[PDB]
Structure formats: C-alpha cells, structure tokens
Symmetry: D2
C-alpha cells in the first residue's frame, strides 16, 4: 500500500501523521514545492513510525509517486474568486503530473474550494470519475451525527443524517429523510442550531488559529481506510453528479466511488441543493479558460 501526498503543509503533514497512527500503508511519499520542508517533514514523520508500524516515509519528486495506490492533494496558495483562480492553476499542474506518473491511481482532493478543485482534477487527469473524489462534506456530516447522538443519547452509528451540497456555509442538511435507528429523527429525540454550529465552525477555527487541519486529516484518514479495507462505507465526498462535483452520498470501496445513493429531498432541500450546484457551476465556468 503506497500513498503519495502532494503538498506537505499543515494539512498534508497532519494527514500523514494520522495515516501513520492508523497503520494502514506501507509507504508514504511526500511532495512539495519547498523541497527542504518536505524532507524535514518526512524525517520527523519517519521518527513517529517508530511507535506504530514499520513504514517507508520519504520526500520525493513526481516520479516517486509512480505506482501509488492513492494520491492525496493537499497543496494550496498562501477574495474567494482569487483563491479559486490561484488554486486552479496549482491543481492543473499537479493533475498533469499525476496523469503522467500515476495513471492508474485513485485521487482524493482536499485543496479548496474542494468541490470545484475536484472537478478540475477529474477533467485535467482524464480519469474515470469513480477514481477522483474530494473530501466534500465528510467532516461536517460526521460531526453532525456525533452531536445529534450526544444530544439524543444514542451512538452516532445509529444517526443517519447527511450534509450535502457545496462544502461551506451553503451546504445543507437533508433533514426530511434523516433518521435514528430507522425511525424519523423528529420522532426519536433545535436540530437547526446544531447544523448551524457545524457549518460555521470551520470559519471560527481559521479565525482563531489561522487555519484548520486536524479535523480534515482525521476525516481523510477515515475515507482512505474504507478504500484500503474495501469497506463500502457510505460517505458524502465530492463526487461527480450531473456534470459537477458536489458533496453527495456515495458508497466508497477499493475502486473508489462504487455508486451514489439517490436520496429524496423535499421542495426546500431540492431548491438549496440546486442553488448549491449553480454556485459551483459558475466557478467552473470562471476557470474554464
């Protein structure tokens, strides 16, 4: 099991640390524009493997990602349109190299805006869409389930609620079909306040410590684990749906997206989702050139 990580900054290094702690890969290759920083991270992370699984951890060039089972893209530049433009250029260059050196790999994109950049990866690489996913709303869906579980006295495993759409303050909860232990959620255990807290927490973290990285590192490691272990767990990654990438329920196994799950939405949820899609489609048009 070989995993390469493109962009060894705060998110890339934290995710490598979590993958080491999960003991699921044999080799991690770290790539960065800053060659010294990647070499320093690789050596520090190698030291951490001492307490877990024997692994190869090394900095490399793009040729060193050849044969990777999975490639994580965690690169990014130091207005929202300004960020999308800057990162689209970065992701295009990364994607041309993955296509060249790892034509058969599976790509998970984290770079923001995650849904837009995931589509860029898919288009530039030419891969099948099932082999290109973004982390979408995976973290927020998991957090919403944990908080509902806590508030209603039940394991999050029994809380079946999805957050879908464009990752960020315009994502939406699919309340109408949410359930706990197979009964409607409203008839089991206000819930809107919890979703609001989840949706906005990322802005608060960035506001206070400058960036966010431990949450996404853990969500990404969970997703990677279901690929490596061929679990078929249902996530809400960024996935191809109707000519855009958007957060949406999907079964993930060793081949990537096995299928999407077409959940039912009421009128208001349908409207928010189509509005989420429209916003994504316009950012894509902007970076078309």
């Amino acid at each position: 099991m070989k995993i390469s990580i493109i962009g060894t900054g705060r998110v890339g290094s934290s995710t490598a640390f979590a993958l080491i702690n999960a003991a699921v890969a044999d080799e991690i290759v770290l790539y960065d524009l800053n060659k010294e920083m990647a070499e320093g991270e690789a050596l520090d992370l190698l030291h951490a493997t001492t307490f877990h699984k024997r692994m190869i951890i090394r900095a490399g060039e793009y040729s060193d990602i050849e044969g990777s089972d999975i490639v994580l893209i965690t690169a990014g530049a130091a207005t929202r349109l300004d960020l999308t433009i800057k990162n689209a250029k970065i992701i295009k260059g990364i994607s041309e190299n993955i296509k060249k050196y790892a034509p058969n790999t599976l790509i998970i994109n984290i770079t923001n805006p995650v849904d837009v950049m995931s589509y860029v990866v898919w288009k530039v690489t030419g891969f099948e869409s099932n082999r290109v996913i973004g982390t979408g709303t995976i973290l927020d869906t998991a957090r919403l389930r944990a908080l509902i579980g806590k508030n209603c006295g039940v394991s999050p495993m029994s809380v079946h609620a999805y957050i879908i759409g464009e990752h960020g303050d315009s994502e939406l909860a699919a309340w109408s079909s949410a359930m706990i232990g197979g009964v409607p959620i409203k008839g089991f255990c206000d819930l809107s306040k919890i979703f609001d807290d989840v949706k906005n927490s990322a802005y608060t973290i960035i506001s206070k410590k400058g960036a966010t990285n431990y949450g996404i590192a853990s969500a990404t490691t969970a997703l990677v684990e279901s690929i490596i272990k061929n679990e078929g767990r249902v996530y809400t990654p960024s996935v191809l749906l109707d000519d855009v990438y958007i957060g949406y329920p999907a079964v993930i196994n060793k081949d990537g997206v096995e299928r999407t799950i077409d959940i039912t939405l009421n009128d208001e949820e349908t409207e928010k989702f189509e509005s989420s899609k429209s916003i994504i489609k316009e950012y894509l048009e902007s970076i078309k050139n």
Copy 2:
C-alpha cells in the same frame, strides 16, 4: 471492571475467551456446579491473558461474584421445548436468587435458552429493574442479516438498517417494511427472503453438525458487553422488556443497560407475526408461573 460468568460450559468458556481477547475487563470470576472444571477453565483462560491484558481469572463461589459490574448466565442444558423450558426455568430461578443475594446492584445478561422466556424469569426472580436485565435475543441473527445483505448489495453492514425481532428461533421475523440502506428503503437500493431464511435456520444446522453452537453467541455477547462497558448507546435487538414480556426488539444499550426501546413501525403482515411471537412467549410464561 469485574465480570462473573455462571455456567462455565462451552458457551461460558468461549465467551470468557472472547472477553479476554477483547481486553475490556480487569477480573473474570467463573462459577459452575462442576467445581474442578471451572478451576481448569480458569487456569487455561488465565494462560491466554498473557497475550492480551493483565487480568484476574479465577473460579469462585457465589460470594466471589460480589461487586460484579456484569453477570453473564450461560448455564443449563441445550426433548420437547416445554420440557426444556421447565428444566431451565428451575436452574435459572436458583441462579437468580443467588445473584439477587450476592450482587444486587449488578447488570445481568442471560444466554440460557429459551432466551426470551429465561430473561423474563431472571427479571422476575431477582427483582431487578428491567433495564438491568437483558438477554441476547436476536443480536447475532440481526448482525448476520446485515452482513449478508451488505455482501449481496455491495455496501458496508454499517449502512444496512434492518432488524430481526420476536422470539429467538424459528418464530423470529425480519422487519422488512422499514429496512433501509443508507437512508433509502431497502427495496430501491439493491433475494432478501432467502437471506433471512438462511440466517434463521443456521443455528439448527450448526447444532446438527457439531452438536452445539458457541462461537457466534460468544462474539455477539462480547459486542453487547463492550457497548455497556464503553457506554456507547449502540442499538441492538436483545431480549428486552416490551410491556409485559421479554422479547427480541430494538433497544439502545449504554453503561446503565437498556436506555430505551425504539418503536419501529410494522406492516400488517409483520404485526401479525410479531403478535404470534409474543403469544408463544406469554403462554410459556403462564405455564411456568407456578415455578417463579
């Protein structure tokens, strides 16, 4: 964390081995009418802890179950069903009177068959609160149904939300009308009836081939115990009090035992079958009432 096991036969010793392998308890006390067998099992199981967790494993008398956090009842023999119900109810009555005396604050998990009827006997004889007395019910069969459905439909069993309920055994039923996969009705996601029949009948096949069954229930019991010890609030289908009988039914399990039941909707067919199960159990209870 102290667990006592009453009846150190095939199931009792297999469950002790699984709990050791799970590394969730500090002390296991083993009880049996056959004193030397319990001592031999305890020594052998102590050897196994070498590779897992430092623990106390010992055979003991009822005074040694004092202060147990959990007591498992795996006693009795595995003949008509009424004859078995009568014989095991007498065994379970005596065990229950001793747990009442020596571990009045504990939580009891009953495995002895027929598991729903015997769980009710435990509850009545100990005088415990019903949340502190449960049987293993349909937990194994529900878990197997979700695994097989997930295999057949290409999804994790964590995403298959289907329950087997009712009287453990040939009378149990799958709550198909409310089953779902990933928050979509099961029909529209993916044959189900054949998978259920395979699950429901497998215990008979195992028993006919190797004489008894023990590894499946040992693993299911260990999972239930982990949810109590870890205060997880996971949903199981144990034997739980539902109005005026113990029966397999969805329930939230945490450190205090049964937190609540989950009232699922059943269609007309399923309601008829569940009521048939409840009737069978209640008539067994009425038949052994004079023994309680």
Copy 3:
C-alpha cells in the same frame, strides 16, 4: 493471507477463533477426519467473523489447503510411548498431504509430543527446516515472563528469560543468562518456584477440565502474527538444532526461522539440555520405522 488448520478439535477450533479475533488472515480452511464436525465448526466460526474482519471460513478437503501461506497441525488421537506411536502415524499422513498440496507453505505443528512430531513433519514433508516449526515452549516462556514481571513490578517486555528443551516437565529455564532491563535478574528483584508452577500447570489443567486449548491457541496466534507481520520476534519454538527438533530461541519472520540465537548455559543447564535432547532422540528412534 490463507491459513489452513488440520484437525478441528478443541485446539484447532479455539485457534481459529483467536485468529478471527486477531483479524490477520483473509481465509481459514478447516480440515478434519470428522467431516460434519469441521463443517459445523466452520459455520459457527464464520458467524463470529461478523464482529471482526470479513473472512472466508470453510471446511475443506486436502486440495482446499493449496496455496496456504501457513498450515497449522492440531490433530491428534483421542502411556507416553502409546501416544507418540499413535500420533506419529497421524502426522505422517498429514505431512504427505501437505507436501503434495502445499509444497511451498510454512507449517506450525502443535500435535504432541510437539518436539518429536515437528521432526516427523520436517522429515516426511522434505521441507527446509526453516519452514517447519513447532510451538515448543512458547507458552511457558511467555507465562514465566509475565509472572516474573508481576513479582518484580516490571513489564514482561523487559524480562528476558528463556525456557528451552523438551516441552513438558523436563524443560528448563536458562536462569544463568536471564535478565531484567539489561541487568542480571538476580540483581534486579524463589524464582524456581515460579518456573515449577509454570512447568506443571498444563498437567493440572488437563487434570481438571480434561484438556488444554486456550493457552496454546493464544500462543499460536502470537507466533502466526510475527510471521504474517514479518516482525522478527524472538520465540522458543520447536526448531531444528543438532539433528533434533527442540525448544530453543529463534528469530521468526515471514520466512519462518530466520536464525537461532546461541545462548550460553552454565554446566547444570547444559547437562539438562543435553538430557532433554537425548530423550527426544530416543522417541525419534522408536518411530523411525
């Protein structure tokens, strides 16, 4: 990772259960003379996998052990010479089938007397000795370390003491070179009583519950884990030493016995070890024919 188990009695089924609980193999094939009993065990054990790792668990014929990475021999008949004669016939037949259907596998023998039967396996299969081991004194060495650790207030990981020789009441502790955290054991923390208790405990278990199986199942699973994970852990299996199989320190990795460790013994330990060897060599002469 495919493991086959020959003899699905108390030890065979307990070991399969422990291997399932350890989640290290993808497939276990169970063989027994009693075909119904093997099928019943396989189905019960399959049910246990539900709570652990997805696995194939099945009863099979000898052709079904083809391709096994590891084969465990846990078969045996229902005086000591009488048992050795009875089990030697059993092990010869099993070994001829392993040679035929799994020529490239690694064999771990548990059938008693474990040191004698391990040699029979080696000779009949024609395998390289590094690919044939018995469980030797692994359990008793582990127990001695746990009890010393408990009595002296230290982790068993830091207790370096070996039990060697013929498994049973004539095995011996290599006290003169034992140590705790790299100082002589006598100068760290009577120890003879602990060893005596360890050596004799198996007779007591058999005496009280008719047989023993959970201890050896756990020791065998530990040994299998160091092979599968290529750990290079030091055990005291039955290994080829000077034209006999005998319990002795050895490094175990994915290829089996990587090497033995030639520890130093004082005069009395040397005498006991050579006496242990002589006893084994005479049982081998007896079943030569």
Copy 4:
C-alpha cells in the same frame, strides 16, 4: 482520565492530536498565553475526536487544570544555549508555580528544552515528589536506535536491549558495553557507531529543514503517557532524578510515575562520558539557581 497541556504550540497541539488518536483520555484541557490560538486548536482537535473516542477538548485557564491526572509542559521557545536555558527557566518557574497551586496531586511530564535542566526546575519549583516529575529525556532516540539496530540485524526492536543515556542532545551516549539482542551481547549477534551518530544528529537536521521538530516527540510522549495510564511498568530513558540531577537514564514507569531507576553497568569510556554529561547539566543548574 484528564490531561492538561501547557503550551499549545506545534508540539503541544501535535501531542494532543496523538493522544486523541490513541484514545486513552476522557478530557484534554489546553492552556496558552495566546488565548484565541488555544481555543482554535481545541475546536479543531475536538473535530478530530469524531473518528476516535468521545472526549472533552477545551481551552482553559489554570483553574481548569484542577484534578488533572497528568500535566504536559510543552511551552517556551525552541541564540546561545545559556540564553535559552535562562529564558525557559523563567517560563518554567511560572508554569510550575501555577501547577503547584491548581493541581498539586498531578504527575508532570516536561518537554520544554533543555529538557533535563527544565525537568529539574519543575521538580524544585513545584515541590513535588521526584517520582511525579519526569522529562522526555532520550526516549525518542533510544527507540530509534533499537529500531535501526533491529532493521540492520534482522530482528524485532523488542529484542534489542540498548539504552541512550545522559544529557539529551549532542552529549548523550549509547551504553554499548551492556547492550544485548535476545539475551546475547550485541557484538556477537550482528556498524553500530554510525547508527548512533545518525540518531543523535537527526534532530538538528529536521530543525534546519522544516524549522522545528514535533511529530517524533509527540509520539514518544504519547507512548510514555500510555505506560502511565495503563500501569505497564515499561522501561524508558526519561529525564529522571539520578541522585542530584535530572538526566536521561533507564527507569520503570507505571501509574505512579517513576517506580525505580535501573542501575546499568558502564565501562570506563562510557562512565567518563556520562560524568561529562552530568557535569554539563549540573553547571547549568548552578547557573540558574538564583532564579529558582
């Protein structure tokens, strides 16, 4: 199980993440002079617990470390060594006075550099028993040496019994004369000196390349904490009191902290080097005595 972390910088937050991933604590309290940064780290780390263990993670003031089972000190800046010793001793004195006041019964693990000197300052200022104050010493370097030796000689690191001791850094030494593999002197089992030099110098290389080091010490600290929480009695080389200085040295670690040291024999060369290390530490202590 409650752990407080004083100094939520690169090392403090990385160690919190590793402790979360290890699932050994129920509550982590994070303290920092930079209040908003600590709050942001706590929120981000709370998100990570979603995938591991239900926990409380929160930023707090010193009153919030009351009742902590363990307090980790990861504060200070990473200039001469004497200037750093002076500046960090003042930081550590203030932290130690606050832990003394709000968590007088706790166990302290110091990471702040220079780790041996600072650990002694913690011990002196808190007035704690020495078994309850330890530094991370040479724990990481010892673990790395055993891993690399095992790789080179084809054996598990569990079978390599070698210690790095002395002052953490360029002054530390390997106790080669008593090192062993599988109960045989290391020379006769399997170049060692080059492996040690690689270990001893790697921190400098990491720091020059990525500016700081944090993942290795976070993992080593988490292993040490697990041995305390699990009452394991594993042997480490933390910074521990050895007569009248704190220095890296073999020690048995259990739920009470340092159970005992292990007096290994050193040859003449190693004794000279260890005495040189002790001298360096003691003269730093004498130099900052007026600050204590």
